[PDB]
Amino acid sequence: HHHHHHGSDLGKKLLEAARAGQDDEVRILMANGADVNATDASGLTPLHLAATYGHLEIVEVLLKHGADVNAIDIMGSTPLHLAALIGHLEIVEVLLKHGADVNAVDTWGDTPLHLAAIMGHLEIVEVLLKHGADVNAQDKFGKTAFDISIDNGNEDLAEILQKLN
């Protein structure tokens, strides 16, 4: 007649804390048994959510506790894709330092470089390239980061990418 914590429920709470920036709750939930790699049918893990929503401390805490840096969600996105899309530079850097795959592709063949390019995140583009992003990478639509940048009128970025390559 021993009762136990409800693991699924602690995982759901950990997802909530990671997206909302509740850094102490992240630590407490894992201490009580929450799966660092918890998810739901979306495949967004706590690390995906912390990377999307810009929570640097939480990204660090989750990685220390064994989060999969290269987890993929139902869209094929890794945490690095999401930090690159939303524009969280410091998190891009931390993910790369922990082994994030700089040329990971999502379900449409886009790399983090492609996503930083559409949103015009110049500093992130530079860090990705320094860490090995393939500037010539083509997504499933045949497009490079250069193509995406000029298609969206990101002329400062397109001018940079055209010199590389």
- How wide is the angle at C-alpha 45 spanned by C-alphas 38 and 10, nearest 5°? 35
Say what the resolution is, in angstroms: 1.2
Helix H or strand E encompassing 160: helix 155-161
Q: C-alpha distances in angstroms, 91 versus 13, 60, 124? A: 22, 9, 10
**Using alpha carbons only, how large is the chain's radius of gyration in Å?**
17
Burial degree of 160 (CB within 10 A; 0-12, 13-18, 19+): middle
CATH no. for 1-165: 1.25.40.20
> Any alpha helices (H) in 3-137, and if so which ranges?
7-20, 23-31, 46-52, 56-64, 79-86, 89-97, 112-118, 122-130
99 CB-contact burial (10 Å; exposed 0-12 / middle 13-18 / buried 19+): exposed
